[PDB]
Amino acid sequence: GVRSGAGAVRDAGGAFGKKEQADEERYFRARAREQLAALKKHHEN
Amino acid sequence: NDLYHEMIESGVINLKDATSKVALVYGQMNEPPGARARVALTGLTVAEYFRDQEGQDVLLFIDNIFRFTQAGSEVSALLGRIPSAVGYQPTLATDMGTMQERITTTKKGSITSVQAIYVPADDLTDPAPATTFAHLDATTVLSRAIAELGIYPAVDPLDSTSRIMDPNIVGSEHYDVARGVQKILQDYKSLQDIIAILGMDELSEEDKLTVSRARKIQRFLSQPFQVAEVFTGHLGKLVPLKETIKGFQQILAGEYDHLPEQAFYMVGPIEEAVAKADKLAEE
Amino acid sequence: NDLYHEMIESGVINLKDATSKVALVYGQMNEPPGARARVALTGLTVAEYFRDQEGQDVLLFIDNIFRFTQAGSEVSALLGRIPSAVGYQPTLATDMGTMQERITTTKKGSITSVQAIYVPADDLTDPAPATTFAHLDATTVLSRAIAELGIYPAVDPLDSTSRIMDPNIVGSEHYDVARGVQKILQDYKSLQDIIAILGMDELSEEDKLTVSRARKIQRFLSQPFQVAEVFTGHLGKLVPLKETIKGFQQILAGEYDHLPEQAFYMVGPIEEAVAKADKLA
Amino acid sequence: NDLYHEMIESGVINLKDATSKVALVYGQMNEPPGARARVALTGLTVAEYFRDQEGQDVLLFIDNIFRFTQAGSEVSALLGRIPSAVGYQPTLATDMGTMQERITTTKKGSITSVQAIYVPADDLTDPAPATTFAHLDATTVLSRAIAELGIYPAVDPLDSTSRIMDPNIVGSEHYDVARGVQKILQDYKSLQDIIAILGMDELSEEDKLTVSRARKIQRFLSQPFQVAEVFTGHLGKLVPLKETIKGFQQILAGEYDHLPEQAFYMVGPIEEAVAKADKLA
Amino acid sequence: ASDAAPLQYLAPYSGCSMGEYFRDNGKHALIIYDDLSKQAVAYRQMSLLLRRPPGREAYPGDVFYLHSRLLERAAKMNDAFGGGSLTALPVIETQAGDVSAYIPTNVISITDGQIFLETELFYKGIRPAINVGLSVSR
Amino acid sequence: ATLKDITRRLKSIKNIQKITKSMKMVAAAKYARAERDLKPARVYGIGSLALYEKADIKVPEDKKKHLIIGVSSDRGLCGAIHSSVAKQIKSEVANLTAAGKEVKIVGVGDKIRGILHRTHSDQFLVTFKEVGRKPPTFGDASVIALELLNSGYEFDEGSIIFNRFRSVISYKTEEKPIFSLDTVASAESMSIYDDIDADVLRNYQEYSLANIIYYSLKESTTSEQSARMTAMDNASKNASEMIDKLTLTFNRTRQAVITKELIEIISGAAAL
């Protein structure tokens, strides 16, 4: 019987894999910006 | 030619006097299939002499060992053999084993063999790379998906295996760090499917931390190479084992959850990661 | 060996007197492919004797037909014959036909074959299961979910199909009763999905009565077996077709809607169901 | 026979005086493989004579040209050749090239050839329909999936290509309109997966606009045919180049983003689309 | 295509020799094989007609050798040999973007870099449709 | 395509189907909780609106300002809930701006802000987020009303738009006027009402604004959970259909691959 596994959405490299990659990158770019701002504010101290 | 000139200018091969440390055996793709099916034997024969006749340790670098199987397959049809699966020779496993068993550490000497194995179409279920897995203690699988992300080396963390990976050999701390890294990367693979439909912003606060740690670990696995300075431009790094263990343990513990994931990309020790983080913060 | 001793315990085969009912023809896996290719024909000849020289309604069992196909493919491959699609013998259809066509109803008697089927790669479109289905006249599927539900035999009432389930063959009454039972079971599946999602109070009185009737039906499908009397201590029942049809028709008509659900569990005729209901309270 | 009688009725073939314009060569599927592998050569030879020894402009309609390759494959098994991929003849490209390169426009005359190429099992990667791509200037690839949606003709807009599709030859406006249509169709096809799984409501407003415009373009590509009038009952329409250029440019611009999708189905000029939209007001 | 299969099999080597003339005489040459897939088909026809046993996809066993002994003649000579060069631009046709096919994989393994052209990028208005994500240069 | 591509796509769609079904069950549970919590909220909202139901409190004539309260959530995958409320608020904004009345809009859902920010970016007064991640409660509504008053936009006439829960499958995007201004609260009916004063009526109107915000939040969250469940069920059904189609294609491709490889082996053996 044919089955599947974990993390097979990005393996197919279809629309959903690219969508997930773009969403993760866009979220973590904002998170990196916030962390950089906080680190700069801390380093000013 | 590039390797020959690099080793000439690196002092490993010295033309002026007899202080060279590397022998070269070269049968390239322009050679007929008969030649490419025997150069591995010639190189491993030189290694065998350096192992048995002299008691010194030997390093045997083969690139690429798949061409031996490919050359055998090329000559098999004219040799008068019914083709095996995927058009390989019926004697694939036999000849591959006959070659590989010679490259072993004996009681007289030890040969450390670093063989590069070409995987056709990136299909590791192909017989030629599949049969080689049983012949190797430590295996390093470089995947195209990781390379396309920019992570170099493209070693697959969840596919590479080593026989010495065991708490009784590498210590409890090393084994725990490695298993934690692999487990968190597997959990990240599981969560990627959810992120595909649900959306990253819709995830819980607990698994967002796991995803961030997994991203940091994926980027921190990357490392610039001295031989790769011409491409990336970064200075080559050589991280000691304890530094790698400490850095990955700190990342697992969340000690650097306040640093951006960009700081862990193409760096050496974790101190370089924090230095890059604060340098990015300065701008 | 397990089946042999289980049959001995069940009494279908007796080692003392000549009251045995099964003739066993075993081709083991350790035998060459030619042996397994002809074991089915050996059993079929044993059945043909009873059909022709005695005029009995013989019952042939093949466990399983896929291994017969595999043995045929291996035998053809050993003879150096170019294989067909998905690595099967060129004579797959003809060998299967020569095996199956002897399983028919002559004027003297008949042979009925209940052949176990294994679907390779779970692909009903593979050449072996397709060629086998070309000759099938009915299918009985034993679902593990039904067994976990506690209904024995575990025949799935929905996935099991029969080609002769037609009004022109089994009669208008039988076809109507069976179609009504299947429709009620499908409606019960839908209402069970609704109950899984929403609450049981959401559905109307009609939905509740259909759920109750369907539960009564699916517990009435359970039946004690004479071969299992020694184990479970429950007497086996040989329910005639007329009694089955009448009982299910009366259940569909809502005649026994007042009886509890367990009144129909592991009983024979519906009279035993009403007797069990009387036993309860 | 239908083509012969149609050409007799239309007067392109006259049975009385020597005013006929079209010559017919017929080797059909009833013929043995030897005949079917050379009839195309007979028609090609007639076209060669008309092109060369008379210096005329000739149209060479071939249907179907895949049967030539199929006949070659049928005969090569008996000729004693080791089969190539998918059991085809090893001389699959050589004979095809020999036949095709004779169908060319020389300096003596021009052979405007239209060839119908059968695609076995709807597999464009099959060697026979794959090696013939290199022999064609303009390619029209029909698709079964489009024909399922009722868009007749079933031309695939993202698989049909032409060599004169260049701004220097076809004009800047024509090239721009064609490229815009192809771009929006490709964007819609890329979006089809998310639409298929999640739904239309999950897209952005611009994505919804692109999907609507692309669906309207897909409907507007369909066109009734005069030969197909006896089939669907819709009068065939023969649009000029400028009219369809203007219609597709207007659709891409957005002038018709308020009309329904069905307003562009089985119509000719965009005036027919706007006169059909108000019918279902 | 009208020319015999041996001519199509020999054509890349003829142009390779013509380029090698420039390469060994201090001049720089560029050679384009368009396309090596059809040369592979011609070689397959020649081998099969010569009763040589077929291999993967009916191709001969040494299809990899056929291109490897050809593309390896594209070199950059040093000053001791005139300083010439021969840049090679082989072309491979892939069916439905199946880059994991036999001949495409062989040629990719032989060459130093790949210029992936994708029909999806072509129709999206990106012309030339060079997929810079996968296109590499060693 | 090839076998590998079919396998990858089939496995990806299988994972997507599993995720959609799990989200359908989660949305069903949240819908059940919201349905349980809606009844006291429904009674509270009806009681809050009863005074204006039993009194002809209508805006006398044109008013310069107007606040629109678009209640929505931050999550997506809700179908046409956010689309419907955005369409309603856009239509109301256009209609009220046609009369030359200053229009300001407050959106408690980040989705509303994202949808309306392309065009109605300036009209945003105060935007709220983190709505729908947890069940709404009167504290959040009180905070929203408090900052609405503290925003400094003294809208003489007001209104609120929300998706009222009608059934598990049906919802209505309802608009309810808000007479938050003290002067518009006083009318002919307030003459009968005793102890109206000015400050008491003002505080009562502010509390009624908080109450209607809370009621709209409860109705919106119930509708959103129901629509989320329905959309996830539809996505799961579509994924299952695609799964079976791709399974048939995968079986065909697997059989074709086996046959092709065996034919190659047989041809190689025979040509020897």
Measured torsion, CA atoms of residues E64, E66, E67, E69, in degrees rounded to the nearest 10: 110
F204–A contact, CB cutoff 8 A: no
| Residues of chain E with C-beta less than 8 angstroms from the C-beta of B122 | 100
Closest CB to B195 among A8, A23, A39: A23
Q: Is D261 left (phi over 0), alpha (psi -120 to 50) or beta?
A: alpha
Is B163 labeled as ligand-binding? yes
Give the neighbours of chain E: at least 3 Cβ pairs within 8 Å: B, D, F
In the block, tokens 């249509």 appear at D181
- What is the distance of C-alpha F206 from the center of its chain? 24
The CA-atom distances, in angstroms, between F271 and each of D81, E47, E53, E81, F265 are 9, 12, 5, 46, 10
Enter the DSSP assignment of C182: H
Measured torsion, CA atoms of residues B199, B202, B204, B208, in degrees rounded to the nearest 10: 50
Contact E110, E86 (CB under 8 A): no
E138 in catalytic set: yes
Q: Name the closest residue on chain B to residue E76, using Cα atoms.
A: B1
Q: Is C19 left (phi over 0), alpha (psi -120 to 50) or beta?
A: alpha
Burial readout F241-260 (b: 16 or more C-beta within 10 A, e: otherwise): ebbeebbeebbebbbeeebe
Contact C86 F255 (CB under 8 A): yes
Query: Under 8 Å CB-to-CB from C138, ≥6 apart: which residues?
Result: C160, C161, C162, C163, C164
Query: Under 8 Å CB-to-CB from C30, ≥6 apart: which residues?
Result: none
Contact D265, D219 (CB under 8 A): yes
B205–E contact, CB cutoff 8 A: no
Number of helices (H), then strands (E), in chain D: 13, 2
Reading the block at residue F104, the tokens are 């300001």
Beta strand D57-62 with D110-115: parallel, antiparallel or unpaired?
A: parallel
- CA angle F26/F31/F34 to nearest 5° reads 130
How far is B256 from F64, CA to CA, in rounded Å? 54
Q: Name the closest residue on chain F to residue C77, using Cα atoms.
A: F266
| Interface probe, candidates A11, A19, A20, A21, chain F, greatest F C-beta count within 10 A | A11
Query: Under 8 Å CB-to-CB from E6, ≥6 apart: which residues?
Result: E42, E46
Q: Name the closest residue on chain E to residue D102, using Cα atoms.
A: E2
Count of positions (residues) in chain D: 281
Query: Under 8 Å CB-to-CB from F122, ≥6 apart: which residues?
Result: none
| Interface probe, candidates E20, E47, E68, chain B, greatest B C-beta count within 10 A | E68
What are the backbone angles phi and psi of residue E117, rounded to the nearest 5°?
-105, 125
Contact F15 B193 (CB under 8 A): yes
Q: Name the closest residue on chain C to residue A2, using Cα atoms.
A: C121
Contact A9 F250 (CB under 8 A): no
Contact E2 D97 (CB under 8 A): yes
Beta bridge partner(s), residue E117: E130
Residue whose C-alpha is closest to residue F105's, from F83, F81, F88: F88
C64: how many CB neighbours lie within 10 A of its CB? Answer: 14
End-to-end CA gap in chain F: 32
Q: Resolution (in Å) of the shown entry?
A: 3.0
Contact E61 B74 (CB under 8 A): yes
Contact D98, D45 (CB under 8 A): no
Enter the DSSP assignment of C235: P
Contact C140, C87 (CB under 8 A): no
How far is B222 from B151, CA to CA, in rounded Å? 5
Burial of F76 (0-12, 13-18, 19+ CB in 10 A): buried
**Mutual angle of helices E36-49 and E63-71, in 10-degree steps:** 130
Residue whose C-alpha is closest to residue F23's, from B22, B202, C45: B202
Beta strand C110-115 with C57-62: parallel, antiparallel or unpaired?
A: parallel
Reading the block at residue F124, the tokens are 């945003």
Enter the DSSP assignment of B111: E
The experimental technique behind this entry is: cryo-EM
End-to-end CA gap in chain C: 46
Rg (CA), chain C: 22
Helix spans in chain D (H): 2-10, 33-36, 39-52, 66-79, 92-100, 127-131, 144-148, 167-170, 172-197, 205-221, 229-232, 241-253, 270-277
**A35: closest CA of chain F, how far (Å):** 21
How far is C141 from C143, CA to CA, in rounded Å? 6
Is D163 labeled as ligand-binding? yes
DSSP result, C52-114: HHS--EEEEEES-HHHHHHHHHHHHHHTT----GGG--TTHHHHHHHHHTTSSB-SS-EEEEE
DSSP H or E run through B127: helix B127-133
How far is E44 from D179, CA to CA, in rounded Å? 38
Q: Do chains D and E touch by CB distance (3+ pairs < 8 Å)?
A: yes
- What is the distance of C-alpha A25 from the center of its chain? 4
Contact B199 F76 (CB under 8 A): yes
How far is D17 from B254, CA to CA, in rounded Å? 96
C145–A contact, CB cutoff 8 A: no
How far is D235 from D224, CA to CA, in rounded Å? 7
Side chain identity at B93, as an amino acid letter?
A: A
How far is F179 from F209, CA to CA, in rounded Å? 8
Residues 6-25, chain F: which have Cβ within 8 Å of B? 15-16, 19-20, 23
Q: Name the closest residue on chain E to residue B118, using Cα atoms.
A: E109
B33–E contact, CB cutoff 8 A: yes
How far is B57 from B51, CA to CA, in rounded Å? 6
Residue whose C-alpha is closest to residue C245's, from C270, C226, C216, C266: C270
Side chain identity at E22, as an amino acid letter?
A: F
B247: how many CB neighbours lie within 10 A of its CB? Answer: 25
Query: Under 8 Å CB-to-CB from D157, ≥6 apart: which residues?
Result: D181, D182, D185, D218, D221
Is C166 labeled as ligand-binding? yes
Q: What SS3 string covers chain F? A: CCHHHHHHHHHHHHHHHHHHHHHHHHHHHHHHHHHHHHHHHHHHHHHHHHHHHCCCCCCCCCCCEEEEEECCCCCCCCCCHHHHHHHHHHHHHHHHHHCCCEEEEEECCHHHHHHHCCCCCCCEEEECCCCCCCCCCHHHHHHHHHHHHHCCCCCCEEEEEEEEECCCCCEEEEEEEECCCHHHHCCHHHHHCCCCCCHHHHHHHHHHHHHHHHHHHHHHHHHHHHHHHHHHHHHHHHHHHHHHHHHHHHHHHHHHHHHHHHHHHHHHHHCC
The CA-atom distances, in angstroms, between F91 and each of B229, C256, F120, F153, F178 are 60, 59, 12, 21, 18
Contact D265, D254 (CB under 8 A): no
DSSP H or E run through D115: strand D110-115
Contact C71, C79 (CB under 8 A): no
How far is D58 from D48, CA to CA, in rounded Å? 9
Query: Under 8 Å CB-to-CB from D204, ≥6 apart: which residues?
Result: none
How far is F227 from F30, CA to CA, in rounded Å? 11
Enter the DSSP assignment of E136: E
Enter the DSSP assignment of D16: S
**A20: closest CA of chain F, how far (Å):** 12
Reading the block at residue F33, the tokens are 């909780």
